[PDB]
Amino acid sequence: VRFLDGHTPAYDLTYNDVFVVPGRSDVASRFDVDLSTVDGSGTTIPVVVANMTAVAGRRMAETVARRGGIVVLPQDLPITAVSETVDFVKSRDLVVDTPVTLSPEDSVSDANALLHKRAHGAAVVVFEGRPIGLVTEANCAGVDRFARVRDIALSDFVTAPVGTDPREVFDLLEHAPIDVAVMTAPDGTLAGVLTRTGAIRAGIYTPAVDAKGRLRIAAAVGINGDVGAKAQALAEAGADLLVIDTAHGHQAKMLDAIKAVASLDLGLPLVAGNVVSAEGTRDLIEAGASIVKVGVGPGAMCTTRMMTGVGRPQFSAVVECAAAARQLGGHVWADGGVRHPRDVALALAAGASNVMIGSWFAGTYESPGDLLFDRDDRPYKESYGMASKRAVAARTAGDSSFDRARKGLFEEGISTSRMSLDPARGGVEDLLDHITSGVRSTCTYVGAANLPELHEKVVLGVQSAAGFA
Amino acid sequence: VRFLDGHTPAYDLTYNDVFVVPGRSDVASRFDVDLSTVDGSGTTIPVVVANMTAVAGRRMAETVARRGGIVVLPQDLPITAVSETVDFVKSRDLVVDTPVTLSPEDSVSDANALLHKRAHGAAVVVFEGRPIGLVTEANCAGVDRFARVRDIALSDFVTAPVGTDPREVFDLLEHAPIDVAVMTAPDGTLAGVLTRTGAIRAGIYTPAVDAKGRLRIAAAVGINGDVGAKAQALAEAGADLLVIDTAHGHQAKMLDAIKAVASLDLGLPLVAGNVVSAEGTRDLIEAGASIVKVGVGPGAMCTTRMMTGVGRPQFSAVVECAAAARQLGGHVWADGGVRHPRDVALALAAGASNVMIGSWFAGTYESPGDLLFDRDDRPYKESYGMASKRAVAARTAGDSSFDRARKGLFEEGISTSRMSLDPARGGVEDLLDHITSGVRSTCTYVGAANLPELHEKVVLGVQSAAGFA
Amino acid sequence: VRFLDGHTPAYDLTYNDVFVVPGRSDVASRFDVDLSTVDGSGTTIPVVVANMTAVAGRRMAETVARRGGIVVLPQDLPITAVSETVDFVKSRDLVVDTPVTLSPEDSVSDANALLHKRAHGAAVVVFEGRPIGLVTEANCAGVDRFARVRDIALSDFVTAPVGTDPREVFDLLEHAPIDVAVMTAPDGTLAGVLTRTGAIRAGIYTPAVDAKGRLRIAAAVGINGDVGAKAQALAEAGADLLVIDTAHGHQAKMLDAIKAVASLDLGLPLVAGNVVSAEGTRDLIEAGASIVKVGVGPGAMCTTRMMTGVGRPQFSAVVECAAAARQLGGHVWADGGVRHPRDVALALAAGASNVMIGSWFAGTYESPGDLLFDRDDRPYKESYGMASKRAVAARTAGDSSFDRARKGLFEEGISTSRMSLDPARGGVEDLLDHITSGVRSTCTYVGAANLPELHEKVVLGVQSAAGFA
Amino acid sequence: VTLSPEDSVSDANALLHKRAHGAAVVVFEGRPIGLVTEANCAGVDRFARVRDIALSDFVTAPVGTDPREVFDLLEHAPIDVAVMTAPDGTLAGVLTRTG
Fold first, then answer.
1. Contact (Cβ atoms closer than 8 angstroms) between residue B317 and residue B323
2. Which of A134, B245, C158, D3 has a C-alpha 20 to 30 A away from that of B12?
3. Could you give phi then psi for residue B24, rounded to 5 degrees?
């Protein structure tokens, strides 16, 4: 990377210490920029969903795959659940989104609960595979709490055949009272729904698909036990990417796991981490890892850097890891704390081929967590609220109560960080649009048509802390 | 510019990182300093009003031109409105200010609304061109809400002929109960008003006038469409300065626009921006721009630097751009975030020939926005409250709803930043006095009689962030 | 110590300026790390309790000695009290903890007061040396305020013989309603109690014992009067470590005191302080001090650095003192402000053989201060609440009221800093577990099996203050 | 209050408050399986299918028993509900000490 003249600090840099200097640009608009990655993950956008239990959901996987990203499944899930998730994801359409389907004679409370599980805002009533109506907001107000769904149905939905160009579907929704377009198969069976914003995103974004034309998905494996057996089982399940993660990637056990998994020669790209050093990245790549995960305690006040003195600023670590990996032909992923598009833009400029988003996507409808309201009816979802129970479901490992208590004595309990739902960006697609707009604006300011060009021509500067007063 | 010995930081500097070291001075008082610019804009003060819809008003243009500045009109205004504004501004007197005129039989609510549109605090009643009285504050209290103006009039206004030396006009207002001096033409028709503070400012300040002895004004053009036609239309309308602005000035489209406008050879000075690099300034000047606009995402926590990593500290960017432009014979304008006279003083010391003020002037009476009160009756004006509607009035460009939605998907909505009215500095003239006093004190401390001398003898130092604790 | 390339700041570093870079590690888990010190203090953990009146209690001494640390007694205590404390501490068991014993016919209010003096949560009723029952929480609710203890007793306590392996004691408490295991001597007399967490800590931690197999303890002496007589009296009392402390250790009087104490040749290790300079450490070691105490006004906003400009950042001072002392064969102790395990980890990485904890341990049950509740019933203990009275008990020194007032005129009154009790970490053993977990995680991240190896292979980096925004 | 298996747990919570017994019986093929009581829905998944938090610890007595002995049978019971079934084992009703 290139810095300004004389900008050679005696310290590691964070995302608050750097800025991008505008250069000569010929890019007309944001749409003239290609965001496709070259790391082999197959994503058309540099957004990757972290493998956390409170974020890596099935609906999230479907949505992110359709919008061009990829989601890594948690490593504690059973093989049957992973196989079911992969089969459901790879059976989805590349344009339409799977709507919330309600059978007749169901409870109205169940319908209200299912309404908020997706950003469409309308749940279709289906009988014999045929749509009957859409249940929308305020339909349950004043109605008997024991209503049987087929009492407040609104059979006023716009219908179009599957395969219609979304350009005309957008026009058909110009004067519709509900921004939902239920499209049915030629035999009349339900296939999916569309919306004006969904049609625009379908025309803007490019879905990330495998060689079979199906949505891509990823899965993770732990560092304990027979790693080869789990890797083989996940590869047979249809996973397109394997991620071997841990708190400290630069250890002998992770090297042994990488050697064991790479010996099988499954052909899938391999992701390992996390390291924040050039030596660690080189050691991980030499062991057989194609993608190196970067970022260990990036924050200066995070729990890791308060328990221990171990850590490193994200920007310098990513720069060093990318510089070490590119000469070996590998790629790096930014696995820090991302809460603004500036972080993603700076990570891409540093040389990272992909940026993974963690807890930020937990505050969306598509996240597996259940929606609950605060005292002021603030929509929010409890991060790590039920992940601890799922974590200890596999942590027990059949050990006795004495061993479990001995392990848990030193273990520090992660608190449940409340994350308020953004009313203007409730769906994860809005956050994806925000991040992609930020990255495209960065590319236009720099004057690059694609991410490698952005990394090539980026010019950075250093600023002091006095500007934050 | 000259810095202290050993003050060579490894980072770019903001306005919080620098300070002015006092030197040997022989300037007796603040009044012994000339603030006239040499950039060719014709302003007697380095204050320029930004071309924003919520600030660039007609009354603001008149007031700033009379006080020695200049105002750039928004580029989205129609040619007829711009022509009307120019004709009204160039038909104003160089000393007296245009008062609020109320015709008889009007609504008292309309009179109360018109009272707050200017800082005079008294609205004159005019019939057959002759003043009848002045409606002042608290005149509408307790009176019927449907009063017809000519029921609470106060015919106790001091009258003086037009052309009287303001020195005696100040004495005539020594014991007057209302600090308004209505002056009428020799035929008895109304021409304008004056006040003690207005007389003092008329004796202190020098109006910025063109070759015809009329108040100066500027207009802006967009970067889309036939730039030459708009430039020709504005030049024919009587504009004295053209400003071609955009988010990123260092692009090929802006270079083409500069080449197209300069090919017409209208003779007017040309302003282009924005760039924060020496290469960008050189490219803009070579294309045919006489004045370069500086500043792109100056704040470390601004919306631009949170969406993207693109930006630069204002001080270093202004210094570099001025150093690059002066050797080419051009001039630079500071277009950062100005909220204190320190910012203007440091920008002038850096080498900028003019400093443009944006949202700061929106919280004044003369701003085009309407005055409204908070729950605690706090006077304030909604910045960008109606500018969005005016922005989309020209952004539609006859495109279809599909294209408009596709454009607006990536667009980020600018929030309406409330700006409270300063009770002691409600009028923009008070802010102008504050800024000019700050600049004059800076000049006296440095020991310079004019802005080029201030830039010549200025000595700067660097301070750490520990002083802000 | 080793820093990253180019990380050579022009200033002294605190604990907020440094971070630990992960290296190649082969440590399987936290339990594969040995925390034993090599400074000669005999502690199995680097935790040392400060010699403050509000912290250095008898129960605290017993608990810290059993958990592997050491406690220094205040220097103002009389020789009889110190002898009694040493005799009580050295008469304790290496596994079981001394419970709260209640005799029959006592006041129930006294029982309630004694309940909160230890973290067991159950006070045993003893008659003729035989346990009768355990008084637990909520037993005093609704009961007459003048109850005689033997009216709400619960004779449902699990009993095991002394010497039983805690592995089976843990199993015996699996279904017990009270997590207290009262163990009695073979003659049936009470000897102590145990708990599940206590059994785990007994199996994890190693008690710090002297050559006689008894818990270790330390005492302090003032710098005034005949230091040799006090040192001889404390050595005869059974103290295992002597600490000569003062505000400014690098003074002639402290050198004379060190020479006087070392002339006696008591054979005990000697601790002196405090100094923050290499010259001071060398002077103290040459005078006859085996351990040098480091840290004088470490905070940038502490009372010492606000009264005077005297001070130094803790990290740089500790590094310099350790570097100076190791070549002379001595050792250094970190005596700064410790509130997080990160501070202890960084102090150990800097080269310190032990880290002393001051006011942090005051907010525990085992501290000598009495427990009192806030308006919201917040458990807290008044730091320095009664230490001032004990300080002036020896400060009077038989001087007249005139001399006392003359001394106290310049003296600044230390305020009583309220320290809230942590509900999840009420006992000091929980804080010890937290700190040891932090240190073990640091060691695993670095890749060291013991503290000297941690100091050998540690690699540090420097970060700017912009990361704290 | 009778709850069939595979029903929504929210419906069970709603049905719990419809009577003063405080316990809703789970019935399958006319046979009681358990009683859903208060705080059973706390922390449990909002989409629970009833037959996941059932408590099969209900006291059973034949219909026609003198309530004097039914009161004694409920002296130490943790739930003050006495589910009584018909001689063929089918559910007929419930009783309590106060009842």
1. no
2. B245
3. -65, 130
Q: Across the interface, do B310 and A445 touch by the CB < 8 Å criterion?
A: yes
β-partners of residue B228 are none
Give chain C's length.
Answer: 469
Contact B69, B45 (CB under 8 A): yes
The answer to whether residues B111 and B121 touch, using CB atoms and an 8 Å cutoff, is no
Q: Answer whether A250 sits within 8 Å of C23, measured CB to CB.
A: yes
Torsion of CA B99, B102, B107, B113, to 10 degrees: 0
Type of residue at B202: A
D interface toward A at CB cutoff 8 Å? 8, 10-11, 14, 45-47
Task: Pick the residue of A194, A315, A441, A451 with the most B CBs within 10 A to test the interface with B by mutation.
Answer: A441
The end-to-end CA distance of chain A, in Å, is: 29
- Cα dihedral: B172, B175, B181, B185 (round 10): -40
Q: Report how far residue C223's alpha carbon sits from residue C274's, in angstroms, rounded to the nearest whole number.
A: 12
3-state secondary structure string, B243-287?
A: EECCCCCCEHHHHHHHHHHHHCCCCCCEEEEEECCHHHHHHHHHH
CA-to-CA distance for A400 and A398, rounded, in angstroms? 7
Q: How many residue pairs bridge chain A and chain C with CB atoms within 8 Å of each other? A: 147
Fill in the amino acid letter for D68. Answer: R
Which spans in C238-371 are helix H?
252-263, 278-287, 303-307, 314-327, 341-350
Number of Cβ within a 10 Å radius of residue B103: 12
Beta bridge partner(s), residue B239? none
Alpha-carbon distance of C196 to C193, in angstroms, equals 11
CA distances A119 to A54, A197, A434, C276, Å, are: 18, 11, 16, 61
Whether residue C467 and residue A313 make contact (CB cut-off 8 A), yes or no, is yes
**Euclidean distance between CA atoms C177 and C161, whole angstroms:** 20
Owner of token pair 């001090």? C289
What the block records as the tokens of B195 is 């006040």
Query: Rounded to whole angstroms, how far apart are CA atoms C137 and C121?
Result: 7
- A443 annotated active-site: no
Take residue D63 and report the two structure tokens written for it.
């219909």
DSSP assignment letter at C155: -
- Taking the C-alpha atoms of residue A197 and residue A194, their distance in angstroms, rounded to an integer, is 8
- Resolution in Å, one decimal place: 3.0
CA distances (Å), B29 to each of B33, B440, B443, B458, C60, in order? 8, 9, 10, 18, 71
CA–CA separation, B140 vs B115, rounded Å?
11
Q: Where are the beta strands (DSSP E) in A185-230?
A: 190-194, 218-221
User: Nearest CA of chain A to the CA of B210: how many Å?
Assistant: 36
Place of tokens 């990823």: A218
- Residue of B338, B18, B4, B337 whose CA lies nearest to A466: B18
Experimental method: cryo-EM
- CB-based contact B323:B350 (threshold 8 Å): no
Q: How far is CA D89 from the centre of its chain?
A: 15
Encoding tokens for residue A136? 């929308």
CB C272 within 8 A of CB C332: no
Which residue type occupies B350?
A: A
Sign of CA dihedral B260, B249, B392, B220: negative
Cα angle C26, C32, C36; round to 5: 120
For C334-351, give one letter per residue: b (16+ CB within 10 A) or e: bbbbbebbbbbbbbbbbb
- C250 contacts C277 by C-beta, under 8 angstroms: yes
Is residue D19 a contact partner of residue D1, using CB atoms and an 8 Å limit? yes
- Which residues of chain C have a CB within 8 Å of the CB of A406? 200, 203-204
First vs last Cα of chain C: how many Å apart? Answer: 29
Could A465 and C469 be called an inter-chain contact, meaning their C-beta atoms sit closer than 8 Å? yes
Q: Determine which of A108, A109, A116, A389 to mutate to test the interface with D (most D C-beta atoms within 10 Å).
A: A109
